[PDB]
């Protein structure tokens, strides 16, 4: 009974980082040595556990989180980072035990003209707690006046569209990310 990793990494559609997706992976024999030996992954960092020797461990629940962001931002997926992503979208805790996998996906999530389907939260009054998921779309009140659901001046929509274009630099290309949370 092998774990449904295929249903997460090889998924056809990934979610926007603001509404990141979580899959509960439990009751299955997982082989993590096939992942760390792929070369297709440009980012494979583990914290609290060693990359090698990952199979010699056992956990109560293993969560798989997925979303899309730019390359310039994959550095923010790690314990203790700051920036638009780790602040208002996806926050790892400081005592994080798991692995942060990510790979360039400019051939799937980019389109001629730009792919705006993917979104990220731009304004938020306070930072996220570790593993907080905020899908609220209320107008961000940046001024002294109420907004009452009307955009305008000092009344902005709190989500921004990424707009990945194939002709961009590598730092602003779409990247698919998977985060493994291990509960010992």
């Amino acid at each position: 009974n092998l774990c449904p990793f295929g249903e997460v990494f090889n998924a056809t559609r990934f979610a926007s980082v603001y509404a990141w997706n979580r899959k509960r992976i439990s009751n299955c024999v997982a082989d993590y040595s096939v992942l760390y030996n792929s070369a297709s992954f440009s980012t494979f960092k583990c914290y609290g556990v060693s990359p090698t020797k990952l199979n010699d461990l056992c956990f109560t629940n293993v969560y798989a989180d997925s979303f899309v962001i730019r390359g310039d931002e994959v550095r923010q997926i790690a314990p203790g980072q700051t920036g638009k992503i780790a602040d208002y979208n996806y926050k790892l805790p400081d005592d994080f035990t798991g692995c942060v996998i990510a790979w360039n996906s400019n051939n799937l999530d980019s389109k001629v003209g730009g792919n705006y389907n993917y979104l990220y939260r731009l304004f938020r009054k306070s930072n996220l707690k570790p593993f907080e998921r905020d899908i609220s779309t209320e107008i961000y009140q940046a001024g002294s006046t109420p907004c009452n659901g009307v955009e305008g001046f000092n009344c902005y929509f709190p989500l921004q569209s990424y707009g990945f274009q194939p002709t961009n630099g590598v730092g602003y290309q779409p990247y698919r990310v998977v985060v493994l949370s291990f509960e010992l």
Partner: antibody, heavy 117, light 109 residues
Framework: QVQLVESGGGLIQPGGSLRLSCAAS????????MSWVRQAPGKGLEWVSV???????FYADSVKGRFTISRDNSKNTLYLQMNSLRAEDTAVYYC???????????WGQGTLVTVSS | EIVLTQSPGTLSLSPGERATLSCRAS???????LAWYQQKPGQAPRLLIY???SRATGIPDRFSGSGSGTDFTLTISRLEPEDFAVYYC?????????FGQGTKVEIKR
């Protein structure tokens, strides 16, 4: 309605400290990104610091470890504590609200800071 | 580390002429993440264009920018006696954000 008024500028000895203020009207500094932008005499613009609405802060490399940007929610004022100033720090310091770490869409009036012995 | 080189350095033109300012970057500026600012003499910069095309609020229609990748351009269709200032382009497609050195729009005589 919406205004940005700087203060705290003046002549200061090299190596000394100075705190700039940015009284805001119509804005809520605790709800916007707030950046400091300095312009040396005759030269162009230069980004200094920024403080995200959530609290995170970032600094240019030429002022890293010497400047500290903060805010007082109670007085709706933006601060910029400068330490170990030097002559290359002399410039007009603007405080501006920027649209999310992107562009600065509303600027203040500017306050001159002169560092000279 | 993205460096913006505006050109020319000064631009001599008379009221009513078309003004075109260049802004070339060393590396690709992803997504057309480029702004344009105007600084009249003795005043705080003002925002003109955000996004290399999207016009700021209240800015007159004669301002209009274009460009993509490594070459941008702020154009002034019919210049006015109050558009003789320095214009800064600014990139935010990578950190840290950097400015240009400026283009001065003179008065041709």
């Amino acid at each position: 309605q919406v205004q940005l008024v700087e203060s705290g500028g003046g002549l200061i000895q090299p190596g000394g400290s100075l705190r700039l203020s940015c009284a805001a009207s119509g804005f809520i500094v605790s709800s916007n990104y707030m950046s400091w932008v300095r312009q040396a005499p005759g030269k162009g613009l230069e980004w200094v610091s920024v403080i995200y609405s959530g609290g995170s802060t970032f600094y240019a490399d030429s002022v890293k470890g010497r400047f500290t940007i903060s805010r007082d929610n109670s007085k709706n004022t933006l601060y910029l504590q400068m330490n170990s100033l030097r002559a290359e720090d002399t410039a007009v310091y603007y405080c501006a609200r920027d649209y999310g770490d992107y562009y600065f869409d509303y600027w203040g009036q500017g306050t001159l800071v002169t560092v000279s012995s | 580390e993205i460096v913006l080189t505006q050109s020319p350095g000064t631009l001599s033109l008379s009221p009513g002429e078309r003004a075109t300012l260049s802004c070339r970057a060393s590396q690709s500026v992803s997504s057309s993440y480029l702004a344009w600012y105007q600084q009249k003499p003795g005043q705080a910069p003002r925002l003109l264009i955000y996004g290399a095309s999207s016009r700021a609020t209240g800015i007159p229609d004669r301002f209009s920018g274009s460009g993509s990748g490594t070459d941008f351009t702020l154009t002034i269709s019919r210049l006015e006696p109050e558009d003789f200032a320095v214009y800064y382009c600014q990139q935010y497609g990578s950190s840290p954000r950097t400015f240009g050195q400026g283009t001065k729009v003179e008065i041709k005589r």
